[PDB]
Design a binder for these strands. Sequence first.
RNA 1: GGGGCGGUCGCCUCCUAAAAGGUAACGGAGGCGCCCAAAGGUUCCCUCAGAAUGGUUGGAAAUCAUUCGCAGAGUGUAAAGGCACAAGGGAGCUUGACUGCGAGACCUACAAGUCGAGCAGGGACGAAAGUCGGGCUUAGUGAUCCGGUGGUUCCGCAUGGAAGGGCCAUCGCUCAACGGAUAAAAGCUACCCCGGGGAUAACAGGCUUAUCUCCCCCAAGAGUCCACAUCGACGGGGAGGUUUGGCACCUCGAUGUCGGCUCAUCGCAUCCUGGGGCUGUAGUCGGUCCCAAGGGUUGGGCUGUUCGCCCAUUAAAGCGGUACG
RNA 2: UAAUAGCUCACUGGUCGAGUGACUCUGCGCCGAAAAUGUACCGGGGCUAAACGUAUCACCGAAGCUGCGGACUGUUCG
RNA 3: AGUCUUGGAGGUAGAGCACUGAUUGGACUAGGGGCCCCUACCGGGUUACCGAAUUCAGUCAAACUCCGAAUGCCAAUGACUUAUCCUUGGGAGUCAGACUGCGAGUGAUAAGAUCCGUAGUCGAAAGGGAAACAGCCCAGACCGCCAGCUAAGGUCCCAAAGU
RNA 4: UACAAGUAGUCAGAGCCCGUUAACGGGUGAUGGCGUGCCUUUUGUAGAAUGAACCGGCGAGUUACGAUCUCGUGCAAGGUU
RNA 5: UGGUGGCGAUAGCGAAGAGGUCACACCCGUUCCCAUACCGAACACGGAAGUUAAGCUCUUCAGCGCCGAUGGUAGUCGGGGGUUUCCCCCUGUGAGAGUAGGACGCCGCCAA
Lengths: 135, 58, 82
Amino acid sequence: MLLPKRVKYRREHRGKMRGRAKGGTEVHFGEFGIQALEASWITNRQIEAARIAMTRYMKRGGKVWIKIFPSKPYTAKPLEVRMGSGKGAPEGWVAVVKPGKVLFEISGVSEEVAREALRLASHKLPIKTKFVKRE
Amino acid sequence: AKLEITLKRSVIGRPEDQRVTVRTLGLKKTNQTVVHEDNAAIRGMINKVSHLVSVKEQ
Amino acid sequence: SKKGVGSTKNGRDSEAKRLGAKRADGQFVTGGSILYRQRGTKIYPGENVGRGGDDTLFAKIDGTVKFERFGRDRKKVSVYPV
RNA sequence: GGGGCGGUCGCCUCCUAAAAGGUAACGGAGGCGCCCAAAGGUUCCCUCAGAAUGGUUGGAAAUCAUUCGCAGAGUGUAAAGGCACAAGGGAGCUUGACUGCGAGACCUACAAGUCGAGCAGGGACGAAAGUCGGGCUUAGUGAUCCGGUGGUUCCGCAUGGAAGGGCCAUCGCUCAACGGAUAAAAGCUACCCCGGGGAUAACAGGCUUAUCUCCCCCAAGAGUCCACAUCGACGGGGAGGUUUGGCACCUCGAUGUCGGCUCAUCGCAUCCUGGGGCUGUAGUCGGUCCCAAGGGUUGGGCUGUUCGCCCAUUAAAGCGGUACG
RNA sequence: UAAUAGCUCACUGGUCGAGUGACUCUGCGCCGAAAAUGUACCGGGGCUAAACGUAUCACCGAAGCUGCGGACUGUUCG
RNA sequence: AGUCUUGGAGGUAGAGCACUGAUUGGACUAGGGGCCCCUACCGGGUUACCGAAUUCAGUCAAACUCCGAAUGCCAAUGACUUAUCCUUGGGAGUCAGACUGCGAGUGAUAAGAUCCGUAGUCGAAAGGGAAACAGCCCAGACCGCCAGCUAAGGUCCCAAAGU
RNA sequence: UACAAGUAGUCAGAGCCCGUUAACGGGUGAUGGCGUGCCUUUUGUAGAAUGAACCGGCGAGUUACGAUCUCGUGCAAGGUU
RNA sequence: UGGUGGCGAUAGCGAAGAGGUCACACCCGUUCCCAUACCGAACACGGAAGUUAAGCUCUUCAGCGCCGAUGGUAGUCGGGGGUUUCCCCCUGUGAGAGUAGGACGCCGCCAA
């Protein structure tokens, strides 16, 4: 439910996603993070559900990080209409995950519980993911 | 000095610039041998045509 | 069955004007020939070249146009008679 | 993206636009049908916005003073470009917001639109060089005919005049469906007709699978404790093409459209009958899941109804496909 | 049933005595995988190479090219 | 006209935070909670309870750009190749296009969907391949030959060629 | 010609019959390979789009008056009724 | 050393230190040109009391700002693949924020 509190224009193009991630490739803030290894969209419902599956299992372990904000809106036409005659109303928020981007960073937590917890949070996402730790 | 030009892959179906370049070396139809002198212009011809035509030296 | 939608209120845009280089570097030009159609001072004129009413660059004499750098960032246009 | 209804019709700015120009859509954002006797032209001189600190009425900012301060502020107005050697600000003077032009050049089907050095006459500003043919550039706007007004060294039907007509300047259109049919214009047709179209809609077929129907994955939880007997949140993945849909691909020189009767036939994602596993399965009964399509899978009341609800039976009163057979 | 039981995992001792246990990358493969006149997602037969990957050389393969001839049209001259 | 050399204009892909927006944590506090008491909170002490402004570190953007290619575009000069270019006049048809690549829109980055730019083919192009097939691949039919070599594809057989 | 499905052809092709505007002949063809009519309209037709039962006949760009262009003629700063 | 120029700030912004007999500039006072939408700092006016304090010129330094290729990549022309809202191989081509370092000025012309 990461709402961008204000947005410049409410309808942008969907865009295309080519190549590897621009930045935030490796673990930077935490010790262990989760990395995605192919391109797709990612939305706020998924990100919130993942953060629940992470943190609620994690309870008092430590702290978490998110380095994805679903800034870009995506629209959809209302159900059962003929297509055309103006762009549809926006109804949601999405982010791009280019392959190589780290998703979430874990902190203050030993390696094995973080391992199984990131593994649990992986199934919420629709993408193939890889564990990466800090160098 | 003189290097000969032998067209292999047919010109049809290939785009306009390749078509016109193949025309400028006098390659009217497929599978003839066209003798030309050597300098940078003809060399430019052969590396940006490079796959419809084979080159060889005398 | 259908559902009625309309009111896009976006479908208008002006007839786009031609702006840009209408002579190349090293061209022989003639007296009174335009060289670059800008909109605002993208290039300040140099010698033998004026500035029009709507910031147009026109050659005062027949000659050869040269494009050059003016200062750190800007361009300059000039005419050298042959 | 069938028509109707809705919206729009001209002009200007950006993105879409694929680093020349151009480039569509009922693609994404705004503006215009003006204003300015100075918000012009010249000459001359400067310089911002914001912040910090002091100072009263007085401050969160009214007006001063200092310091920092490339531009965040302005640039009449929408955006874009550009502008502090001003195109921003201030002062004096003045009307070049002149006439006759115009080498050439862009753009363009045409009509149009745009720039333009320089020449002539007469100016304005400045001593001069020099600048000035409106706004800082791009919008602020319409054909022709016809008629009005002003000037004419033009013609004026035998002649001389006049009536009138030319030529020049100029006025009259939200002619906004904005390259404008006429000066002058609304609806119904299931009484309807003709010429055509599958270029174009309804049924059916097709593509897609949003929706729908099933199958799943992860598992928080519920389950007296136990996620995984049973159910399963928040999320994800699929399959099918029976629903509602999107597209307009065959058919308008005719492919008969719901339901029912007669007749079947096929699939299995199995309603019964067959064989099993787990059970929060004692036994009578069950719940779920797996193998299984051989056969069977009821009569009435109501509504045109499929569908439903009800009555009474049955082991069971299956779901679907075959141009909704 | 609550220790109360042959008993069992942590852990150590003796038996014979050689491989034994975790992870990463990658090739190829399996389950997931159910439709309607009939096999029906190799064209069939069939194929464990007649599949895939790598390298090499043969060969087939068109109205393409060449060979032989004929006709016609252009350019330089028959 | 093509190509080589050379000169340009141009802000896309990329990249990036310098601007404009968005956005994540660390630090810090202006200032809003926080209750107490004196009480007009006058202020103290007030939980990291929120939280403007700076800095450190990080993430995006068609309408962000301090940068920024490959290509394409416009030229000049010379060199080579090619011969097609302009003007005028006579006479047309064309204004329903489709598919496949790649780059975009709209759509649900669905459609054998629609609408653009660019390339090819069909259109208007038969032959070989992909079973049959317009747009896929290879390749252009002036005729004849009981000639050879080959491209795609293929060589157990149907069915030609290597079990 | 009675074990074969075939836009009905074509080309190979054995057999059989005949013998000519004499010439690398004629008829029939068991069998093999390839192969979905014609026209119109279409982006696209074997089309399940349209038209034709067949045969024969008829059945659609002409003329007038002008204009223009080309060509060719007679004269040529003249030409011509 | 003064005047005026061209070069992309590699020219700067900073931090420190020296100079003035001459030149330059601070200074002196508005009387008469001229002025301060209020004023001799400003415009001009005509002097020379002392003053390097500032302006200005030289000396040093990489703090900021600036310039900056090398080999790496991203992208991309053209070919060629693939399980193809996207990836891969090759001939080329060559990102910028990154450093090797450069730089805290170079060339005139007239008056000492």
